[PDB]
């Protein structure tokens, strides 16, 4: 079985990877070499080689090319691909999948050869049982991404010839989701590439963009490097620079995921033609709102989106209601807004049409808009940790978790922790040395 956890997820989060210890050590290593102009990781080795040839007046040429760095191993560096291995990628992909009028998803990757997302993205969508995915990876040159062609084949992907700078090919046409991995890939120009992508992006689609932010320590460090290649430097931009860049192409930022050192992950949704939205209260306890909603959904001719908003009670289950309604005919109009605060001291934002928050969520236009404890977010599914739970216990018994295999033998908590069976004529005894007999081997062996 697929084991998951149903967790709340803020739309905008900061300091995602701060918990990781290895990433902090990597940042310390990279800044140490940067200081005064050391690890098995590729990026610290690259900086060590840059400092090695010259402590001063280093050739941009010599640091740029060096053995063990010609490979695109930077994306394999934990610092650069930290967020992708984090749950932020899964949350963004779930957000993209959820807000689709159809059950099929069309995703295209730009500069896929360097991005390498083609290997990682398709796996994360396997847990969705009904989702059907059509993946296509595009890179500037045919020889680019020539390696790993078997890795592409094992997944249901297609090659590409699109270079983002030029207008998108008609073959890609309209796609639900665009993934770039701009952190490692090189874009000719930010505004031009964004214009081309938004041209390729369908109406109401999503643009998932991964970038390193300028003005941050690691951002400045990468800015110093790759100075030989101007295109990569243009990819590195300020957070406000990216925010302004999105607006110019009329692309609205639905969500943002940021790392503690500076690596960030942008998610944007192409605006859809503004339509007057219906409003229906869904907090009535008598459930008489079903008839009112039943009538509205009946008029399938109307294309007005319908907003079910519950604000009276945090326990209202409108989330599942809209989840089930969307599948049924005429469900494309449904969109949810719920205010569920778990703390009384927390305040409730106003959802009046005049108020700003409702306008902002309408502009975002996401199906799920759940506000809890001062942050707009939506519930998401994450695979839970594989390791079995363990706790300190005074009572435990040796058990073979899998019959017939000795490698499984491990200590497990014992029912004696409760000691209810103890009674007069029976007593509990500590065990210092426990012997093994033939029958024990026969049992463990299976």
UniProtKB/Swiss-Prot annotation:
Tissue-wise expression: Ubiquitous. Prominent expression in brain, lung, liver and mammary gland.
Disulfide bonds: none
Post-translational modifications reported in the UniProt record: In adipocytes, S-nitrosylation of Fatty acid synthase occurs under physiological conditions and gradually increases during adipogenesis.
Residue(s) carrying Phosphoserine: 39, 276
Residue positions, PTM S-nitrosocysteine: 336
Record's subcellular location: Cytoplasm; Melanosome
Function as written in the Swiss-Prot or TrEMBL entry: Fatty acid synthetase is a multifunctional enzyme that catalyzes the de novo biosynthesis of long-chain saturated fatty acids starting from acetyl-CoA and malonyl-CoA in the presence of NADPH. This multifunctional protein contains 7 catalytic activities and a site for the binding of the prosthetic group 4'-phosphopantetheine of the acyl carrier protein ([ACP]) domain. (Microbial infection) Fatty acid synthetase activity is required for SARS coronavirus-2/SARS-CoV-2 replication.
Miscellaneous comment text of the record: The relatively low beta-ketoacyl synthase activity may be attributable to the low 4'-phosphopantetheine content of the protein.
Oligomeric and partner information: Homodimer which is arranged in a head to tail fashion. Interacts with CEACAM1; this interaction is insulin and phosphorylation-dependent; reduces fatty-acid synthase activity.
Protein name as it appears in the record: Fatty acid synthase
Residues of the full protein shown: 1112 to 1581 of 2511
């Amino acid at each position: 079985p697929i084991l998951e956890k149903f967790c709340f997820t803020p739309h905008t989060e900061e300091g995602c990877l701060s918990e990781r210890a290895a990433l902090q050590e990597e940042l310390q290593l990279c800044k140490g070499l940067v200081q005064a102009l050391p690890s098995q990781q590729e990026l610290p080795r690259l900086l060590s080689a840059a400092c090695r040839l010259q402590l001063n007046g280093n050739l941009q040429l010599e640091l740029a090319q060096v053995l063990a760095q010609e490979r695109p191993k930077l994306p394999e560096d934990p610092l650069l691909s930290g967020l992708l291995d984090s749950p932020a990628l899964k949350a963004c992909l779930d957000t993209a999948v959820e807000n689709m009028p159809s059950l099929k998803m069309k995703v295209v990757e730009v500069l896929a050869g360097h991005g390498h997302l083609y290997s990682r993205i398709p796996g994360l969508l396997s847990p969705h049982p009904l989702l059907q995915l059509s993946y296509t990876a595009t890179d500037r040159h045919p020889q680019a991404l020539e390696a790993a062609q078997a890795e592409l084949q094992q997944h249901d992907v297609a090659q590409g010839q699109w270079d983002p700078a030029d207008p998108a090919p008609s073959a890609l046409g309209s796609a639900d989701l665009l993934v770039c991995n701009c952190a490692v890939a090189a874009l000719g120009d930010p505004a031009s590439a964004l214009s081309n992508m938004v041209a390729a992006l369908r109406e109401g689609g999503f643009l998932l963009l991964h970038t390193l932010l300028r003005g941050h320590p690691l951002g400045d460090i990468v800015a110093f490097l790759t100075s030989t290649e101007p295109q990569y430097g243009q990819g590195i931009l300020s957070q406000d620079a990216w925010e302004s860049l999105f607006s110019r192409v009329s692309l609205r930022l639905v969500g943002l995921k940021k790392s503690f050192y500076g690596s960030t992950l942008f998610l944007c949704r192409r605006p859809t033609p503004q339509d007057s939205p219906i409003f229906l209260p869904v907090d009535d306890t008598s459930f008489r709102w079903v008839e009112s909603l039943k009538g509205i959904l009946a008029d399938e001719d109307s294309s007005r989106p319908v907003w079910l908003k519950a604000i009276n009670c945090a326990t209202s289950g409108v989330v599942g209601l809209v989840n089930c309604l969307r599948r049924e005919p005429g469900g494309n109009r449904l969109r949810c807004v719920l205010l569920s605060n778990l703390s009384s001291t927390s305040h409730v934002p106003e959802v009046d049409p005049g108020s700003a928050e409702l306008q902002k969520v309408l502009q975002g236009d996401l199906v799920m808009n759940v506000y809890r404890d001062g942050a707009w977010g939506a519930f998401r599914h994450f695979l839970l940790e594989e390791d079995k739970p363990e706790e300190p216990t005074a009572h435990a018994f040796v058990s073979t978790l899998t019959r017939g295999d000795l490698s499984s033998i491990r200590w497990v908590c014992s029912s004696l922790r409760h000691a209810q069976p103890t009674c007069p004529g029976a007593q509990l005894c500590t065990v210092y040395y426990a012997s093994l007999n033939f029958r024990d081997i026969m049992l463990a062996t299976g």
